[PDB]
Amino acid sequence: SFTCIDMHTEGEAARIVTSGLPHIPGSNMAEKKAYLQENMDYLRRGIMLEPRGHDDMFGAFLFDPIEEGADLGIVFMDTGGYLNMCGHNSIAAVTAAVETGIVSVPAKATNVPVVLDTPAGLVRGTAHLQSGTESEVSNASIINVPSFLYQQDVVVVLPKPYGEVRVDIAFGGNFFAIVPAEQLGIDISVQNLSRLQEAGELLRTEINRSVKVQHPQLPHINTVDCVEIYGPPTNPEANYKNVVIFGNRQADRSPCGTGTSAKMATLYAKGQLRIGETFVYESILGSLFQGRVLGEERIPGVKVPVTKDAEEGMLVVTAEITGKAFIMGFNTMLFDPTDPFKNGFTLKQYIWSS
Amino acid sequence: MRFKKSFTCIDMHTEGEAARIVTSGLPHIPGSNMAEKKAYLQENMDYLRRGIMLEPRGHDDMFGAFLFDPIEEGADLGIVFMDTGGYLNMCGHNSIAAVTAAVETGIVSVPAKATNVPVVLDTPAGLVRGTAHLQSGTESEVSNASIINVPSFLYQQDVVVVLPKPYGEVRVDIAFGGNFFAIVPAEQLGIDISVQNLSRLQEAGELLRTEINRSVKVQHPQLPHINTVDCVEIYGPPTNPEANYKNVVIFGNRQADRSPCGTGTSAKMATLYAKGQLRIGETFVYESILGSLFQGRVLGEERIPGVKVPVTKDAEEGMLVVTAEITGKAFIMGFNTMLFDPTDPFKNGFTLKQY
Ligand SMILES: *CC(=O)C[C@H](*)C(=O)O
Ligand SMILES: *CC(=O)C[C@H](*)C(=O)O
């Protein structure tokens, strides 16, 4: 049996496994993720998939922190595999840590830091407390790992009825292909969600076939794992609306924190967003996240495709993302060794271009 | 405060199909029988079903039930079933799960040295007599569970239903197995029962259910409150050698059963029995889209003089009903305390499924 704190962040699940896991080696969180992925993938499958989960479930395993200064180690998972970072799950974990007492709250504290050691690096979170409560969280922010536009105006050819599209590749904790919905000929709407999933899958697969990406500081991150499809906002408070397609072409119900970070890095690189300016991203559900670019930095002697010959070094930015998570369940998940679906199942069919 | 309005559940599944069995958290629900309590919930507290069944706490193919104290004489537990669209009068897989959960979690006592434990369910469709078959050696580990369903019957035969393209005109049987079913060969819809075709099967099932309920009036002759076709059973040749046929049942907000569906199996057996194709005691094995198997036997038959349904011939002496036993295996998959913060925008759930 495993104990879980089932959270959701504005409609998007985050199943946070807090106890009962087998002991896992690894000298950092990236190696722990690799160990799970390579040797114990049955854990993910049983916890994420039907019948205990479903095709759009998401979650994370907690571990002791390893990187200096962190409160919790975390490895994220979904219906397909393992993302190096997740903003909505980070917001959920920061929230759960404070509300359930995994991390202590100083006396008279109105903000409580919760630092996550993730496969993509250190993620500095803050739970913003409800005034007059000891540990009720109003919302939570996360300062993401450095983000960056990687490659601009990448042209890929998808099968009909999509054909040729142009995207940006950016890192926000995961590598994203960021594309306007208009180029796909699909409005972002609940009605089009299945098509959005198919386009996202086709675009992700085609991008990884034709562009080889590599995070220049983190060897293990060498694929594009997420497709961010954006368009005009519905809520007048939002700058844009988006849906991210990832995992086994599941869709984020949240605006997606890493995807927002990647979008903000891209806008910033193009001069379209100032440091400290509030950016508001809306989801397919109408949910909002707020983000701000906190700073920028050039890394001398390190280039990505977008980095100019004249430029000694790549531009990165540090972005903060804010959202609200709720506890939806305290769960003890059970696995009878004679249960034929102890490792879950899906009825979703795979798709691929011919 | 945090646990205000929470619910405790035993999350079960029966060969892949969820049964979220709510064990505490409801206030008193007015009603002098289970059918009335079901109507109360549906009319006055439907947001509870939606919050428990739907994302983010559930999903588009979740299923479950509320437990109550039994009202009907001889029953161990009251139960009201729920899904992503509404409330079925009976559910085979959830009854199998409830019998199993009752024994394994000690809701019912296991008599000294027993190998089989009866668990009787008071449902909106009537009394359902369950038996938990214990694993030899163990005190209360359940190997599988059988349920003797409420009376089942073929109701109306060769009903022509006209659906939009690419389906057009189809021929179905209507039969009662605890719910009314329209039973239809997948062949007639132009599609195979396969995971590939699941979305289409859901669409076809929903179309068929809507059209049937407009164009055909059904009425259970002994239970006034049952007067709609709630489920569509789409069947085809088996994949597993052990199975007679395969099916998928579409119901709720066009969700699909991952189990072979016990009420659908009961309706199918009553149909086969009526056509002389199954004898009393003969094992019928039904396969699901997942490859799961349920076993059924017809245990008894009765003609009810003076009571007819559309298939009852003038040559005949009252409508035929059968008593069907269904057997499957359920597992505990979790113990959950579900939370509903009043400021949570999705306290009542959501679905992204089309229209
Ligand atoms: C982990 C994801 O689902 C991508 C969106 C996010 O919140 O980072
Ligand atoms: C309750 C349902 O899902 C219909 C199938 C069955 O097991 O009776």
Author numbering:
A (entry chain B): 45 to 398
B (entry chain A): 40 to 394
From the study:
Gene over-expression increases virulence, while knockdown appears lethal for T. cruzi.
These covalent interactions can explain the irreversible inhibition of TcPRAC by BrOxoPA. The BrOxoPA complex also shows that a second reaction took place, leading to a very tightly bound complex, as indicated by the cavity volume. The saturation of C2 allows the folding of the molecule to position C5 and its bromine atom close to Cys130. The second attack released the bromine atom as reported for haloketones.
